[PDB]
Amino acid sequence: QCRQQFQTQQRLRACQRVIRRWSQGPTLQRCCQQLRNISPQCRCPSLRQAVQSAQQQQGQVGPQQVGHMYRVASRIPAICNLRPMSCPFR
């Protein structure tokens, strides 16, 4: 279950940091390894959880900035060369 994989791979904490990095405040390689270790069909679910989790170390996050964080997270599979390359986050 994707929820379990997310917890096991360190809550994708390095990806949380990439997501905030590019959301108005070697990490990417650790992010891609954490995410690689999640099964393909669970990567977008788990990046969704990473976005949620990343807002917690963030202060105030307005909804525009939140949407930005999902936009960042949706490019991370493709950046990492991991299927499914993009997440719709519908």
Ligand SMILES: [Cl-]
């Ligand atoms: Cl931002």
Ligand SMILES: [Cl-]
């Ligand atoms: Cl690297």
